Amino acid sequence: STGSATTTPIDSLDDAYITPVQIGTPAQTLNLDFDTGSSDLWVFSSETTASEVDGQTIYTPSKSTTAKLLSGATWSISYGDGSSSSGDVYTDTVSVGGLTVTGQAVESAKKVSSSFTEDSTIDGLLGLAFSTLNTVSPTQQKTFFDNAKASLDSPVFTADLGYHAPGTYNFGFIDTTAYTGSITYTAVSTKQGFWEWTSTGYAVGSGTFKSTSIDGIADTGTTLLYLPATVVSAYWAQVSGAKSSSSVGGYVFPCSATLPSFTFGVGSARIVIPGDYIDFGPISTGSSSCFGGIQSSAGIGINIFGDVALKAAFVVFNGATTPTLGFASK
């Protein structure tokens, strides 16, 4: 089997991407944030505290003839941005782009933090990291990809995120028309539960490539590119007037600037992020200070190849027995 679904930016900045997902019988379609940095499929629901729902579409398990309470199971998750959610668990039929999994754990939110409530466009998350990170207790649950894997034509999914435009998540096949050149594959460590890999270096604009190992994660659920402070300083030093602002929470730059590109290494290959992808717009409405799309990871503990980086590539998440990542230009 295969599946193919369009993913759409939630706003004009590509702050996140939503993909429609069919849950239950008859289908209830919710727009979920596909997140290769976490491993829980959770949704706003008829169980979510009413004051914490503000425009999201909700899953109502009592209206699904295939929903079954997973008795005793609870979940609770905290994300790198400080947001969180928690609840109980149902199993139900879940379909993405024509690919159907029966018995998928659908984690129903009883509580969500303010950032989720305040984002009316995201009805939940669909985790695509390794199932060892799934938070369901006392019986850990498998991701949608893990459950689908055996049925797929090939044990892979691909992320093809657009810049200010829709893109595609495919399951079970590699669309050879969706990228240019060849796909370069690189080793993955699953020791932390992430799609963790080592970039071979970077360049800023037209500058020379610096060969240096940068360990980090491919994370579709993180907006920006978070890299070591040395690398990020070298980037922003090429932008007149750019500075790190403690009050804003990162590097800002004059909105009048033209940003240089940023290149990262995948083995001997190179992925070029155009300068425009690094512009996240005014820090507040009407400001002439703009927020940078490349930020330091120094306070995180891990480097994160988020959407800024991934949207410059066609990315293969290869879930074979020894997982690997593939990157192609497009």
Swiss-Prot record:
Active site: D35, S199
All residue ranges annotated as the Peptidase A1 domain in the record: 17-328
GO molecular function: aspartic-type endopeptidase activity
Disulfide-bond pairs as recorded: C255-C290
Catalytic activity: Hydrolysis of proteins with specificity similar to that of pepsin A, prefers hydrophobic residues at P1 and P1', but does not cleave 14-Ala-|-Leu-15 in the B chain of insulin or Z-Glu-Tyr. Clots milk
Annotated keywords: Aspartyl protease, Disulfide bond, Hydrolase, Protease, Signal, Zymogen
Keyword Signal carried by entry: yes
GO biological process, one term: proteolysis
EC number annotated for this UniProt entry: 3.4.23.22
Family from the record: Belongs to the peptidase A1 family.
Protein name per the record: Endothiapepsin
Gene (name only): EAPA
Portion of the parent chain present: 90 to 419 of 419
